[PDB]
Scaffold this active site. Structure first.
Site, PDB file in Angstrom:
ATOM      1  N   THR A 111      -1.854  23.237 -20.478  1.00  0.00           N
ATOM      2  CA  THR A 111      -1.413  22.568 -19.271  1.00  0.00           C
ATOM      3  C   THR A 111      -0.256  23.318 -18.625  1.00  0.00           C
ATOM      4  O   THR A 111       0.675  23.675 -19.346  1.00  0.00           O
ATOM      5  CB  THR A 111      -0.859  21.170 -19.649  1.00  0.00           C
ATOM      6  OG1 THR A 111      -1.822  20.304 -20.211  1.00  0.00           O
ATOM      7  CG2 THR A 111      -0.235  20.566 -18.401  1.00  0.00           C
ATOM      8  N   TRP A 147      -7.438  16.157 -17.621  1.00  0.00           N
ATOM      9  CA  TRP A 147      -7.311  16.511 -16.222  1.00  0.00           C
ATOM     10  C   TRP A 147      -7.897  17.809 -15.876  1.00  0.00           C
ATOM     11  O   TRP A 147      -7.214  18.598 -15.197  1.00  0.00           O
ATOM     12  CB  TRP A 147      -5.849  16.376 -15.735  1.00  0.00           C
ATOM     13  CG  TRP A 147      -5.374  14.913 -15.728  1.00  0.00           C
ATOM     14  CD1 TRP A 147      -4.259  14.322 -16.326  1.00  0.00           C
ATOM     15  CD2 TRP A 147      -6.047  13.793 -15.053  1.00  0.00           C
ATOM     16  NE1 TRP A 147      -4.241  12.986 -16.071  1.00  0.00           N
ATOM     17  CE2 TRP A 147      -5.292  12.623 -15.298  1.00  0.00           C
ATOM     18  CE3 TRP A 147      -7.198  13.670 -14.255  1.00  0.00           C
ATOM     19  CZ2 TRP A 147      -5.639  11.365 -14.780  1.00  0.00           C
ATOM     20  CZ3 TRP A 147      -7.533  12.442 -13.749  1.00  0.00           C
ATOM     21  CH2 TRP A 147      -6.771  11.298 -14.005  1.00  0.00           C
ATOM     22  N   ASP A 151       1.374  16.616 -22.068  1.00  0.00           N
ATOM     23  CA  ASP A 151       0.596  16.137 -23.211  1.00  0.00           C
ATOM     24  C   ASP A 151      -0.419  17.257 -23.531  1.00  0.00           C
ATOM     25  O   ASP A 151      -1.239  17.633 -22.696  1.00  0.00           O
ATOM     26  CB  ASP A 151      -0.068  14.808 -22.963  1.00  0.00           C
ATOM     27  CG  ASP A 151      -0.958  14.485 -24.102  1.00  0.00           C
ATOM     28  OD1 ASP A 151      -0.828  15.025 -25.140  1.00  0.00           O
ATOM     29  OD2 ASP A 151      -1.840  13.546 -23.890  1.00  0.00           O
TER      30      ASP A 151
END
EC number: 1.4.9.1
Length: 124
Positions: free
Chosen positions: A116, A102, A26
């Site tokens: 990511t 995160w 994501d």
């Protein structure tokens, strides 16, 4: 093509959203902004946190456990955006929730989302 179709991983182009490891990605692939499939681009901060997913390696017929760690402290790259949700659960099951940032653990307290990585953390 058909945003509602079953996921179909490939294993030939890491900058494409159907690459087998990005099953639960994501955001944006780090490979498109100076990083790598598993390293962060220069200048960004590697998080200690992550969301996990178990994604099928069409090549070897196996499944590995992907730890989606974010490289942070930068504004979103804007290149190679993806949103895959193979087995993603609600926010109340974070280990598998992909709308959360995160970035926890990045040095200097970086909490802004850049990209990511998709490192393998173990089978299955």
């Amino acid at each position: 093509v058909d945003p509602r179709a079953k996921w179909q991983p490939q294993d030939n182009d890491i900058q494409a959203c159907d690459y087998w490891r990005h099953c639960s990605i994501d955001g944006n692939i780090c490979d498109c902004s100076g990083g790598s499939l598993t390293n962060c681009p220069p200048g960004t901060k590697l998080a200690t946190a992550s969301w996990v997913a178990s994604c099928y390696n069409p090549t070897d017929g196996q499944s590995y456990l992907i730890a989606y760690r974010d490289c942070c402290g930068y504004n979103v790259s804007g290149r190679c955006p993806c949103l895959n949700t193979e087995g993603e659960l609600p926010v109340y099951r974070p280990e598998f929730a992909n709308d959360i940032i995160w970035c926890f653990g990045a040095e200097d307290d970086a909490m802004t989302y850049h990209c990511t990585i998709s490192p393998i953390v173990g089978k299955a």
